[PDB]
């Protein structure tokens, strides 16, 4: 069956270079034209141009006629997008698509996130959000973990090694102006459980290779 599969996410710093791959299968690469599309966060689809899988002579949109390069490897049956001298404005998802010629753009790659940031990889600073019954009803306390300043995404958060699920709410992370990510996860538990019951915040950050288990005690 027809398929386009691209590389995984890429974290780069400004000035660096990146190679994104587009593996086509299920059809013959040389018979259809491969086009490149760009989509920055919260934006529309930018057509970048296309490569001639027949010849291999690429054609770029103006402004992409710069440090962007389209390359081809018909042996492996793969199309490559090269970006040199990366900049913050290059932070975007990049798609490869096939031109059936009446159909589109009928097939797309899943998309490749290129993230360009001056921020170095950083492990989270985890702090305990102690129980507060003010915003919670039913004789119930809300507690949590504040995950401060980590880069890049994602971060995983569980409670009591996963034994606690119901009443949990992990809020999406904010991107501050740093840049760095801050996230906060709250669990809602019975008032009587405290302080007889133990509640631990399991925070996991693969990019930093960091893990933190933080006990959340009631108060002073």
């Amino acid at each position: 069956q027809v398929q386009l599969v691209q590389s995984g996410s890429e974290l780069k710093k400004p000035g660096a270079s990146v190679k994104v791959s587009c593996k086509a299968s299920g059809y013959t690469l040389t018979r259809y034209a491969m086009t490149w599309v760009r989509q920055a966060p919260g934006q529309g689809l930018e057509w970048m141009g296309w490569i001639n899988t027949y010849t291999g002579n690429p054609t770029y949109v103006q402004g992409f006629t710069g440090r962007f390069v389209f390359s081809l490897d018909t042996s492996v049956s793969t199309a490559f997008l090269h970006i040199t001298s990366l900049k913050a404005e290059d932070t975007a998802v990049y798609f490869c698509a096939r031109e059936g010629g009446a159909r589109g753009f009928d097939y797309w790659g899943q998309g490749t996130l290129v993230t360009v940031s001056s921020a170095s990889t950083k492990g989270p600073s985890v702090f305990p959000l102690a129980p507060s019954s003010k915003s919670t009803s039913g004789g119930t306390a809300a507690k949590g973990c504040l995950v401060k300043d980590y880069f890049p995404e994602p971060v995983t958060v569980s409670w009591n090694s996963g034994a606690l699920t119901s009443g949990v709410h992990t809020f999406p992370a904010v991107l501050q102006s740093s840049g760095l990510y801050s996230l906060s996860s709250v669990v809602t538990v019975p008032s009587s459980s405290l302080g007889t019951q133990t509640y631990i915040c399991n925070v996991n950050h693969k990019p930093s290779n960091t893990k933190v288990d933080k006990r959340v005690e009631p108060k002073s």
Binding site: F105, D106, W108, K134, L146, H169, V174, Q176
Partner: protein, 201 residues
């Protein structure tokens, strides 16, 4: 390069239409966080896996995409693309006009002593269960507005199809201990909720 309405709305069961208006069609649907998918090709036609609700229209001055009997899963972004290179139609967000308004639940957490010990401080305002997804967050130090050191998320859908948001006010322990109290003020559909904390606590 092309032109479409930035926004369109309809209630489930209704019929919505997206307009697309010399030098220059195919239509693409895009769910959040996923790649675009071929919706219409040849201007009248759909591939296999496209419902009968979607109908494309060519008029020769312009093109149109009509969805009849709108559904919940149709809430997404829709793109128009004609040709001579490939021209893209720009973004159009389609939001289903179902469900009633929901009042936000606001929970405010003060800085922990461990953070204060670490020569840092953060006020955490967590906002849940509100619809629609429009809220404004204002921070106050002793009834005086603060905007420096504020970081707020763009609201996002929860599991129950309501919206959540979270605001953070970063501080120095000095600033924290200085004032008598800090307030997080969330405004939603002409209604306000102000949560407050104090260093004394």
């Amino acid at each position: 390069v092309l032109t479409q309405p930035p926004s369109v709305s309809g209630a489930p069961g209704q019929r919505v239409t997206i307009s697309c208006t010399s030098s220059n069609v195919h239509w693409y649907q895009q769910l959040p966080g996923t790649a675009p998918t071929l919706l219409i090709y040849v201007n009248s036609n759909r591939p296999s896996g496209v419902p009968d609700r979607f109908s494309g229209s060519k008029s020769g001055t312009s093109a149109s995409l009509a969805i009849t009997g709108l559904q919940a899963e149709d809430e997404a972004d829709y793109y128009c693309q004609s040709y001579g290179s490939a021209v893209f139609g720009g973004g159009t967000k389609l939001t289903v006009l179902g469900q009633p308004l929901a009042a936000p639940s606001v929970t405010l957490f003060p800085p922990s002593s461990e953070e204060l010990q670490a020569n840092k401080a953060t006020l955490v305002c967590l906002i849940s269960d509100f619809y629609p997804g429009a809220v404004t967050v204002a921070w106050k130090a002793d009834s005086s507005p603060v905007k420096a050191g504020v970081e707020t998320t763009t609201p996002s859908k929860q599991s129950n199809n309501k919206y959540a948001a979270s605001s953070y006010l970063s501080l120095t322990p000095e600033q924290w201990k200085s004032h008598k109290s800090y307030s997080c003020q969330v405004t939603h559909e002409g209604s306000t909720v102000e949560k407050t904390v104090a260093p004394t606590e």
